[PDB]
Symmetry: D2
């Protein structure tokens, strides 16, 4: 087997050992593997996959293959691959093009190696995406391949936004399942995953004590909520910035002071609008928004000396790293850990005190400086992915008449019943015991003993 490209194939044995452990940590995913094995519901599926090539993604890949699928894989981020994971996958005869520390050029080349097989477009018919880069390349650069593709299953908030834009503009060519908005994804992965992995990544990069220091978390969505808890539970004094007053209300009630980097919250683009007194006290800033330029150049100028800057949103443009490349000198401490010296561009004193520490060059810090979410959390997200792949593959959108296609061209979530069945396997993994409603109780609250237990409007 040579249809791959990884950092070091000799890491495969190590990756396989960690894959075996991860399988024991992912009961929902492994449960699907045993349930659907004899049926082979993905036989004939040829899946283009683009998501962080971690140990956890390895278990997802092998679940899809075990259910009958062929795949070609790459990572959706230059720093998120675990090289032992990519090596174990390649060693198993699965095409994977991913390594930790890709250049942007290599990142694009890796996506192209999955799209093309032996010089020609692969006969792909399914897409699994995290962020939407692969989805967009197919629409812009390989639209004829989408004629053969039955659906897209998208993992993350940013990718869902990009799908809804295409649907709104009439440019989405195949239906999609919003995997992010399963409760066992968004309210598990996005929140608790970042709770586990944000302080993890900061410790590995800097080994900084967090207790007693000042943090500013930009955003209080699902990622912002879990990120704030990751820091608060270590004893940081956390302040939260938000543009959504409802999310700000939650931050207040959760015990956080709500502040803005700009005086009265108004960014007029001038340095005068920066709350310099506030930013001059911040030891750590974390962006979690999925928005653009939420930690801008004037904020970076005003930050306390030696503050840590990192981003756990999907794309690095949450921080204006371009400004820092243009104006300030970068000192690599170690991979994915740079000191940014604010004294000049073309040199720095080795003992300069006026620097910031930037983690993963602004790319998602939990995957860049650690290993991302733990297996038992990703088990939920990826059990949803497998169910979403099965759902859209069985629909065979590409084989339907143009009339029927119009009725099925949508961006939908999985039924709540499947959301609940994933959650049950997760609960059992903890040794939890769910109570069974009696017939009288089920009738009293108007549900079936089997579920679903909540109306679709329920927010949990």
């Amino acid at each position: 087997f040579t249809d791959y490209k990884v950092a070091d194939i000799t890491l495969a044995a190590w990756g396989r050992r960690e894959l075996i452990i991860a399988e024991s940590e992912m009961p929902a995913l492994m449960g699907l593997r045993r349930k659907y094995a004899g049926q082979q519901p993905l036989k004939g599926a040829k899946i283009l996959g683009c998501i962080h090539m971690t140990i956890q993604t390895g278990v997802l890949i092998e679940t899809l293959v075990a259910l009958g699928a062929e795949v070609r894989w790459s990572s959706c981020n230059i720093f998120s691959t675990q090289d032992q994971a990519a090596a174990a996958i390649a060693a198993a005869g699965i095409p994977v093009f991913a390594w930790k520390g890709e250049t942007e050029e290599e990142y694009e080349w890796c996506i192209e190696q999955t799209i093309l097989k032996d010089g020609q477009p692969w006969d792909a018919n399914m897409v699994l995406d995290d962020g939407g880069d692969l989805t967009e390349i197919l629409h812009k650069k390989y639209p004829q391949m989408l004629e053969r593709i039955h659906g897209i299953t998208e993992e993350t908030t940013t990718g869902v936004h990009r799908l809804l834009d295409m649907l709104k503009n009439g440019t989405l060519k195949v239906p999609a399942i919003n995997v992010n908005d399963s409760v066992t994804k968004s309210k598990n992965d996005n929140k608790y995953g970042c709770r586990h992995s944000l302080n993890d990544a900061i410790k590995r990069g800097t080994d900084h004590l967090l207790s007693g220091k000042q943090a500013l978390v930009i955003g209080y969505g699902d990622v912002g909520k879990g990120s704030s808890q990751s820091l608060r539970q270590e004893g940081m004094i956390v302040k939260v910035a938000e543009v959504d007053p409802i999310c700000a209300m939650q931050a207040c009630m959760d015990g956080f002071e709500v502040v803005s980097p700009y005086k009265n919250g108004i960014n007029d683009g001038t340095e005068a609008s920066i709350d310099a007194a506030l930013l001059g006290k911040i030891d750590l800033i974390v962006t979690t928004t999925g928005n653009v330029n939420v930690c801008d150049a004037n904020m970076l100028k005003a930050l306390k000396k030696r503050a840590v800057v990192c981003n756990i949103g999907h794309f690095d443009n949450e921080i204006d790293t371009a400004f820092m490349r243009k104006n300030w000198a970068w000192e690599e401490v170690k991979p994915q850990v740079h000191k940014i010296h604010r004294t000049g561009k073309d040199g720095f004193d080795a003992h300069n005190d006026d620097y910031l520490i930037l983690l993963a060059e602004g790319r998602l810090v939990n995957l860049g400086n650690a290993t991302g979410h733990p297996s038992r959390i990703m088990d939920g997200s990826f059990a949803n992915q497998v169910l979403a792949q099965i759902h859209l593959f069985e629909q065979k959108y590409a084989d339907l008449p143009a009339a029927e296609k119009a009725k099925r061209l949508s961006v939908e979530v999985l039924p709540k019943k499947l959301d609940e069945e994933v959650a049950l396997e997760m609960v059992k993994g903890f040794g939890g015991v769910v109570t069974q409603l009696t017939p009288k109780q089920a009738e009293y609250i108007g549900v079936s003993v089997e579920g679903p237990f909540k109306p679709d409007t329920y927010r949990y």
Copy 2:
């Protein structure tokens, strides 16, 4: 010359008025609506039948509605939740209120009827504000002619919303309703953080028991169960959680709780054999939060650790099988809303018996029964939604619509997200919080207006 009320002690009005003035300073969203709408008088002509816990916080709600032009007739939705100084202050303001702490069930029904009738005949009501649905059902069953002229119902709580949706499904709901519970600044504020504040509050006032180091079992992990578990865990309790919803159970696990069932393998076959006696024999405190029926049953009550505390914070007392305890065991009142229930028999007890349980508020909602319910700054969000919902339905004038137009608007709906955000903004400012304004580039990048709404309707927060 005003006598159109019944409260426990009108001499408590000055005290209640002092606490209302304090509460106003704790409720900026509600007092913001007062200042914003006072000149416009959007409720001029509204005549509101109100049934919700007659607390200091409800007093501020009542006076906001009146300040916006409404007349009201008020009762409590629970026999133990009234604060007598609040009821007295409202009555002293010239507002008909029929409520006191410690009503009997017969007095409870009488109070509701005193709001429905004025001088022995139906009041010219045209709006309903309800918490739980008792008033709503009485009107549908007994006063359908009054509903003809009523423009809407604004319902506060999860249980009431469920009852409204049953009526709408059956075709028996007579007037449209706003689901006030499912505003985010209600459900994810009141239901969760309010119980966080007030559950351990009520337990302390009733028993003064140390909570740290003891074992608790919370039945349910929806919004009330989430807030209740935190109220106990933050005090240092070792908290276990029961759930029938595996999604909510998954959240309990991730939040750091052990998820257990009172029944072996979670199967309640009705027999004492199915009870996990070893588990229940260790529990010092059980709290029901489900809005369901009989989730702390007779067999669980028999198996509970001696001297365990039993309480409910769901809306209705049938979450616990108190009827079994009245039939079989001897009740000794420690003090109002605190009873020792001696499992040694129905007739008499030894004053030094050790085989008893402690029941709070006779199974009624414990935060309002043994304390004062949610604090003003939390109820600010819920009651700002109530005022916006009254304005919304009153302006629509459903009762005046022709039959064909009524049919298109007979629904149970929530307020628009923009209003939810505007309530939240006033709450955030009340804490001194500063929200950031999106730049035009940022607003375009995430596809929202600089003014909001900032999230799609599918967003769960």
Copy 3:
């Protein structure tokens, strides 16, 4: 029986019901009652007791009586008595003079009614004190009564400091046991007691939401640590002030921002030294120091409008309430809750917004606005009190030759072995199971299987 003065004797039955419950919450105290009942170790003891007349003190009193002692009792604070507990004690034929809401003159009168029986000095031979007021009165006004007193058992930090002042000055006339510095007192009562009862008292007095609001705790000793946790666990944003750098270091590591009411921590006595910006954002200030004037007039002037002010140290002079009585207008909301209108002295407007809320008129707020520490915590403190009374009464200091007295005139703590045996009964009250060292393990760390398990230097 008429040798008492309580607010309402008809509250006795209610207090008895709560005493029966408290007995079930105090296993260390009830274990001493049963272990020593037959031996009657306090036969002949006549104890002058001065400590908050709560339900928990009732169980302590009846324990002392059950072991053979006679007592004459009063409260050490004008607001700390629970009237149902006072009535239940009086109904049992025990002399007690205490009610909630005493004046200062009635307070001084109550202590005198324990000192004197039928107009003559009681023939007391033991003292139990909390704060040292009774101890000082006996030394200053009734020195001849101390000739027959065998010892003093002092409950709290402030009282112990006063005993140590008398000892170093040669004015102490009888030996004393420092009950406070048992670990099952100081590191249980002082810390976790205030954790339980500080937020309890604030809720009862004001029903204010605490989550999301700003607090300032003055002091970070045992009371300050417990108070800060009582607030932080409710979601308050808590800042801590301290003069001790070591205690301030613990506050930082515990996740609190450490601040001073004064610029650079320097109180020059002028309003210019007040950090007006800091204090203008504080919603709640709590004094925990046992020191004087730690919340002074200039701080009270700069506090945010409608801030809550309270003290949980032993004496009210931690707050300059005298300044507030002289210059501002007091409005009583209800007992132990006053609005202090900073608009001036001669009349307030009922709708004025510029006021502070003072709890318990500056007296210890947990006992003033709630019920103090819960029974299962006071179990530890009062088991120590009983052991201390037994210890000094057996020594019989008053009957010894002068050369032998000077040998035993000291302020002692109980031996660590008894400290541990108190803690064991507390642990068993929770259902906890300690492990028994094997002989090999005991030899390995140089202790007895029975304990003591730590050297006297150990700080826990």
Copy 4:
């Protein structure tokens, strides 16, 4: 041409120097001593044998000693605790250091001997800095003539202090010592908050296991056990605590933990039958924190839940009976310092066997073995104490005292509280904290100087 060292890879020096420069900015108390004492050179002539984890933080301590005038010869006190980039950077500065991560036991002993001997003969040492007491014991057993000229020992950790006090009461201690562990800015900072930071850190790096919602058992609740329990509980673990000390057990209860024993009724009867198999069958993670012997024994290891993680954060690996596991079960290395112990037999194993335990750092102290130990800003307190203790004993010059004067000073003592406070003040300033200054009236009221010390020596904090 400097060759008097042995490290894993000297080309890691530049990386180590970059991390030392960062660490200096995180250690203000240590860098304050460097600035305060540089001109005075109070350790001029001092020759320090150092044996403590060769981390970045120890690097800053070493260079502070040298900056104050000392020469050192250094080794690590554990086979897995060295950071190779730190050792390289120290060796590149011309400082004799013998340490690498992953030493064998034989290489461990050799490294200590390379510090003791220079060019084959005893070095002219006159001070000792130790963590655990291995170096101290080797000198007493094997190099008594060197101790004649040594002025003192400054011992870092609880286990080492116990060994010093044993020798003192036996009359075998040859030079005085300072107990550095029992400074408050050490024991109640390093031992507690250091393990809070670094225990979950090491567990994540080794296994990447989710901790939230899983079951842990912490053996011990002293300073290390307290910090370790918080490390897991703050992550959402359901933590149970074992203790032999009822006072420490009381604190665990009040801190919100269930206190349990691995043995039924806490009594080891010498058989598997006294093991609480039901309890241990539910534990996902066990951590030993005691400084005792065999507190996680063979029968406990046999009863642990399948796939449980086993680690030790006390100083020595004999807290866990790893010898039993080596003799009876098959070890599969996952990666360095992470082994699956297959309980199916000693010979081999099926790669998909489910009946295994995961052992971290082979039972060696896990925060340093699987991560980097305590963070710089915590070690700042410990190592500022170490510098002050070295100064204090070196200035005393015990070795030069006549016999009758030595007898008056042969002791194991702590630093004065005033110095403990001055270390804390620098730590507090590092956070931006502002301590308040007592007024003269306030200082008089509580009977202290405005400069401190602020507490009596009896105070426990």
